[PDB]
């Protein structure tokens, strides 16, 4: 019943504290999501973030929670 | 129209064109082959009599 | 076959659709899925001749 089945490759490339950024924003009826995977609280200096990934959803978010395991 | 000269601008992977000051286009992106080609307008000047 | 919303909660983005039927409130007095007198279904079907 999926829509949406892209293959990427793992999220935690490093193998340091692998500090993961992570933007998501609702525009217009269009999911837009931002990464980077600078190494290093949170610290100084300034890291752009690529938008490389983009997994569009499109419908409505007021409310999220982050899945564990 | 102009002339079309190999680049050396580090493009990240996710851009595939380039502006200048007035916002025209300078780099471009070939489609085919994946590399990156300066614009330059053609040579001009004016002329006096 | 063919159905239109009349009662929303408020307006829509642009792009979104909307597929839950649920009882309209317009007052105070609660629906709980009743059609009451001031509860409305939102969907009326086109009437096509």
Known sequence: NCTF???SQPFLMDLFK???????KNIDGYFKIYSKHTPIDLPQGF???EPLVDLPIGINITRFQTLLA | ??????????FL???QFGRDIADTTDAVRDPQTLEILDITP????GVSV | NYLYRLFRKSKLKPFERDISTEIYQAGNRPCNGVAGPNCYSPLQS????
């Open chain 2, 1 to 10: 129209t102009g002339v079309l000269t190999e680049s050396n601008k580090k």
């Open chain 2, 42 to 45: 053609c040579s001009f000047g």
């Open chain 1, 47 to 49: 890291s752009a973030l």
């Open chain 3, 46 to 49: 086109y009437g096509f001749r």
């Open chain 1, 5 to 7: 089945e892209y293959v």
């Open chain 1, 18 to 24: 692998n500090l993961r950024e992570f933007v998501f």
């Open chain 2, 13 to 15: 992977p996710f851009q």
